[PDB]
Design a protein around this ligand. Structure first.
Ligand SMILES: O=C(O)/C(=C/c1ccc(I)cc1)SS/C(=C/c1ccc(I)cc1)C(=O)O
Ligand SMILES: O=C(O)/C(=C/c1ccc(I)cc1)SS/C(=C\c1ccc(I)cc1)C(=O)O
Ligand SMILES: [Ca+2]
Ligand SMILES: [Ca+2]
Ligand SMILES: [Ca+2]
Ligand SMILES: [Ca+2]
Ligand SMILES: [Ca+2]
Ligand SMILES: [Ca+2]
Ligand SMILES: [Ca+2]
Ligand SMILES: [Ca+2]
Lengths: 173, 173
């Protein structure tokens, strides 16, 4: 069922050029969250979807091919389940005290200073983070760890970069 | 006149906490672009303004104090004038061929590969970049150069970043 069902829905979503644009990604994400009222959102905005695309676009076509889209989609599916699980008060949002458990359940063990920066950038003035912000934060975070690890194969904890490389890493995102 | 007029408008914009939030920034940027029918925009969205705020927030308060905001606002003023100057067909947008001249007029000399990457990430399927996307790109680009330079203390053209610093620089942005 599900290998074939997935190919069907990628093909219908990707349309005539067989790749998923940021706009196509935006539309499907907004259509789907509408069927989960336990995921509170103000919507996936175009800018957030361009960022999710850029970060997942390994082969630099500007768009998401089948394998890139499948990796993204499978993460979103794991992460949405984690979001529901760690929303222990059923507010439909992840507050400051729920967040470390949720991120830790996604494989990230960050220090306090980083959680504080993330809360400033992505959560509201209550320290509450809604679903599109949470997804957007995790797609980026997972991509940044992966980028760094690709440049640090021997686990030195350091990478060395020139300006061209730096700009590629920080602006194609 | 203009040192005092500026302090007046910061104070009125920043309001009760004396710092400019992403929402306050959004609102002023949208109010001002409305008076320039030569700038085409779909609007400054909340997520883009949170990003501009994070990238300019040197002291990590979550908001833009007087000096941070003055730096941002003075760049926006120079950059809007450049946008108008390099929109040679008055489309209200900067296309692929207008873009290198515009960025070069802002002090960034990038190679072809980097201009292509910027177009993929910030310009639409036509290769057109509207005003909020242009500002947003420049704020981030200027911040990423500045961040490189702060880390290249020996003037070698290379930086060493550890994982902690990488995650801070990429996630609080
Ligand atoms: O638990 C799951 O299986 C899913 C959870 C989920 C929840 C929110 C988002 I945004 C994306 C995925 S995705 S399964 C699914 C596939 C599907 C995708 C697009 C369309 I149009 C119809 C069905 C759906 O719920 O619609
Ligand atoms: O060069 C100019 O005159 C202006 C440049 C400008 C600044 C920001 C944007 I967005 C678009 C254009 S208009 S903003 C301004 C003063 C001003 C500030 C807030 C408001 I509301 C109206 C005017 C000034 O440049 O002195
Ligand atoms: Ca498509
Ligand atoms: Ca691709
Ligand atoms: Ca909650
Ligand atoms: Ca949101
Ligand atoms: Ca304020
Ligand atoms: Ca600040
Ligand atoms: Ca133009
Ligand atoms: Ca725009």
């Amino acid at each position: 069922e599900e290998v074939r069902q997935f190919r069907r829905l990628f093909a219908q979503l990707a349309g005539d050029d067989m790749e998923v644009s940021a706009t196509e990604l935006m539309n499907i994400l907004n259509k789907v969250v509408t069927r989960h009222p336990d995921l509170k959102t103000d919507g996936f905005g175009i800018d957030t979807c361009r960022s999710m695309v850029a970060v997942m676009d390994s082969d630099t076509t500007g768009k998401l091919g089948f394998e890139e889209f499948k990796y993204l989609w499978n993460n979103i599916k794991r992460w949405q389940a984690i979001y529901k699980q760690f929303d222990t008060d059923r507010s439909g949002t992840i507050c400051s005290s729920e967040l470390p458990g949720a991120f830790e359940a996604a494989g990230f063990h960050l220090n306090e200073h980083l959680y504080n920066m993330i809360i400033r950038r992505y959560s509201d003035e209550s320290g509450n983070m809604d679903f599109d912000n949470f997804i957007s934060c995790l797609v980026r975070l997972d991509a940044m760890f992966r980028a760094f690890k690709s440049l640090d194969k021997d686990g030195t904890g350091q990478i060395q970069v020139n300006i061209q490389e730096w700009l590629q890493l920080t602006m194609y995102s």
